[PDB]
Fold:
Amino acid sequence: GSSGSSGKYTQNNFITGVRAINEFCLKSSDLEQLRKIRRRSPHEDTESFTVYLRSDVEAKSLEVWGSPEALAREKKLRKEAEIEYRERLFRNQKILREYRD
Structure:
């Protein structure tokens, strides 16, 4: 059989690969360099994936960029981006309906 994946965003003890490569902005060769954990094969006969340790990926960003501040510079933008979106949406939703519109 087969099985796709889920969307949305969520933080846990473990972080996906592509999720860290896009967030921490690293190289595919760097991630693979880290320890490859498969949750001790929590489910067989099904397409699995490799997960990395948040603590490990963190250092990988400091050893490359040099410091966590260098990366934060890019994180800020991506962060404010979503805010700028939901922002205009907030006022568009309003608290309720009042008077004509």
About this structure: The longest helix spans residues 68-93.
